[PDB]
Amino acid sequence: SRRRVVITGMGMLSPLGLDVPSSWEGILAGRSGIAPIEHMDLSAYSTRFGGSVKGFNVEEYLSAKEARKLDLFIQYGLAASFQAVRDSGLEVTDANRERIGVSMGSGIGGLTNIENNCRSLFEQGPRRISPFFVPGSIINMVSGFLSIHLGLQGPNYALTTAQTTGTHSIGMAARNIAYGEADVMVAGGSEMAACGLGLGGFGAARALSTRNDEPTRASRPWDRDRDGFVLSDGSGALVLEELEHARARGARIYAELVGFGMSGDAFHMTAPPEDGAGAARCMKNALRDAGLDPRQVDYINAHGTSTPAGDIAEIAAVKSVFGEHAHALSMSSTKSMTGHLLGAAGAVEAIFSVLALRDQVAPPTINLDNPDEGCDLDLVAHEAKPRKIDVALSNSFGFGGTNGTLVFRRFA
Amino acid sequence: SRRRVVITGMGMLSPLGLDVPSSWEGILAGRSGIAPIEHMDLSAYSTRFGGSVKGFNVEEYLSAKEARKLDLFIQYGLAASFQAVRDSGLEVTDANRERIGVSMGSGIGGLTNIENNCRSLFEQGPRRISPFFVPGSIINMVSGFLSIHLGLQGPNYALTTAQTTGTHSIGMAARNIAYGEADVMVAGGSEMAACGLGLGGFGAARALSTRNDEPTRASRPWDRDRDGFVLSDGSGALVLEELEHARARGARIYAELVGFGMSGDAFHMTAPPEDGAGAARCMKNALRDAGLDPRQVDYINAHGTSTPAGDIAEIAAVKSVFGEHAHALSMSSTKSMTGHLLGAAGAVEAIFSVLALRDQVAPPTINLDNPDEGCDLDLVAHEAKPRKIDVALSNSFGFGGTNGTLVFRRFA
């Protein structure tokens, strides 16, 4: 019968910092991690800025010899995973290694590496493709390499659900534990899609903000002057652990994961429906899964991408799910500061939701100068709002109409 | 407790045929789908052959215009899925669409699209990248496009566990139904990595057979003269259904899915351990999940890739798990005929395991001319073997040390 799941460790790389506390400091201070991209020449691109990880040192975690073989999305996923495991205080032993697994996902995976090897193939032939092209680029290799380095022999897999990946990865990992398939899971996601094909491909869809001359103001969820999402890189990992297993080893418990919802819109390849019907179905699934009255919800970490249709669909969904209580909860988009980490978005935003519970503060939606028509909820405009938070919800919505909702609450 | 899950619909594209019955007819006749790859300059490559899908007509499924937006791996996944749903006879309605979901995965995803868009980018800059590059290349778009086309509102996701994808996709979809999150799931995988990058990438790791003079003899699992796997394309999809749901509408039930195991080797990025310890834990997990004794297993669809180390690890794992019953069961690699469909391997092999149960016959391992040292099990060399099969296992062991096992049982 279904066991309870708590969060005992967290790890992160974001545009705001090389760990959780540094990133959260930036979140509570309203700081933007968005800047013109320095790592390649984007003068021919319509978008030339994004949320880069600044000053990442892979040699805090791995040999440079092993790092050279791995796409940045794998290096980022391993860094966040290592941080989460260390933060948990868990010791991997012969007695528990079969009960500890990993589900770290990505939306796009090793596009930089695949692009670079495509370059080698086209210009020089197949004999110049890296021997490590496959294991250094495919999405399941965060889970694979983490298992090899720490000796995790539990369920080992990866999700890829576009911008929903980090949320689904955490929810499904919690089900593994809830249903007895594992006692511990390291779960989350990682992304580094800031290569020619990434920026070019989202550019070709006219999905990205083109505010090149004021990049810190580009990400403006629910603002009337928003013009698309900001592309961002990084990773989030959580250690999920069965409650009695956590109690039995004296673990520090940050919060309890009480609810997980999924739904499909079945509407459009890329566009969300204006009424947010699939997001509403997903949130209602999560709240019923958590055994909650919707009025218990205090804080929502929105998907809040800064797209015209996505932002307004989320307002419509929250009003539909929460009715008059929609005016009492606080909802913010931390993508206003971090930009959109795609497959890692749900992983870092799950961490932000847990820290909202720990610190009793709703992070701001920065850049919300002029809320759009019908965007009249408490969206925590400009500045962090200290408040009572017993229940926090984190939403993600992605291409294919794929929705995820996580429900966290304080643990006593 | 837990609901029972049965298979009510199957769909496939393989190197043996454009549907299940054509493919299965090839399998039972010991036919090879392996041939030199056409309409592709493989001059500079060490491997020039594989398992292609022959004569696929996407306009049976999609308009030309909608097909132009999608990588071949997505087309293949959608074709298998549509076939599976048609085969099931299921009627999607407003009363049941929230209970029907999708989990179709891929190991490598849209290499062909990435290749062609790299060519645009490198030759003409980013403004010539297709607007549909991202949604037409990402792995979750088989689930996405299927959910949109058929109006499926249930759990919508995609696994990516390299060569284990199809097995994990089916197993996790079965968990959704068993634990009441859905009544129907479409599950499986698809792959089209026969581009320069796939043949080049695996070739750079010298993972592929280089038997260019005799492509149909290349895939020879457990044969002393094997020299690595054969790269193959296609897709498998199953309709998984809660038993009472299937009986209420008078569905034809092929077989019951009674067990699912997962494990991690935590050993090496690409090679399994010599003793197959992780594959043994995974099979034991799957049998425990099914409440079955190893002695009850009749037929194993091996991973059987024709790699020196992988083939021998599976022999060791089966001797360890099955002890005095290890010789009584039959174990065969259908990869001897199909080649290795990577993320779709476990999907087509689950279908072959179900058909082994329907027709009471172990498919052959062709090309098994000289068993290697210690390969003395009943490997069904050369020709199909009619026999009693109540319980059939299907195993997948992929990069990252990720393992999956499915347990199917005859249904009456």
Ligand SMILES: CN(C)c1ccc(CNn2cnnc2)cc1
């Ligand atoms: C591998 N080949 C030969 C290749 C690589 C990059 C470029 C374009 N960017 N570049 C970098 N260094 N010079 C130009 C052109 C050809």
